[PDB]
């Protein structure tokens, strides 16, 4: 049926948009999880450098 083929083009439109949305949501996932690895890496580094600074100041004053 011709209108069945039009239903098929609607279904293929949904397949096109669904693979677009699938890559969009997976892209947001990989993005935000990498940038939270980023900024968290940095927080760890400044904390452990500050802790070694505490070692510096306190041992020299003692």
């Amino acid at each position: 049926s011709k209108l069945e083929a039009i239903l098929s083009q609607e279904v293929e439109a949904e397949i096109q948009a669904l693979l677009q949305e699938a890559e969009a949501k997976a892209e947001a996932v990989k993005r935000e999880a990498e940038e939270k690895a980023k900024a968290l890496l940095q927080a760890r580094e400044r904390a452990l450098e500050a802790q070694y600074r505490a070692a510096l100041r306190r041992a020299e004053s003692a």
Binding site: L40, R44, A55
Partner: protein
């Protein structure tokens, strides 16, 4: 990768922590002994020049 970097990162900088704490403790030990012998050494150059004059000063 986050937990691996955190683990090895902590390993490295804690080892630097202990290296620091000895590296300043024992050096301040040796300088404190040098300054103790220095203040005793400068003191034991005049220790009877002072006590002679002040036992003069106490005595009426």
């Amino acid at each position: 990768e986050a937990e691996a970097k955190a683990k090895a990162l902590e390993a490295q900088y804690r080892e630097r922590e202990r290296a620091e704490t000895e590296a300043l403790l024992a050096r301040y030990r040796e300088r404190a002994e040098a300054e103790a012998k220095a203040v005793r050494e400068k003191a034991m150059a005049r220790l009877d020049e002072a006590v002679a004059l002040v036992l003069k000063e106490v005595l009426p």
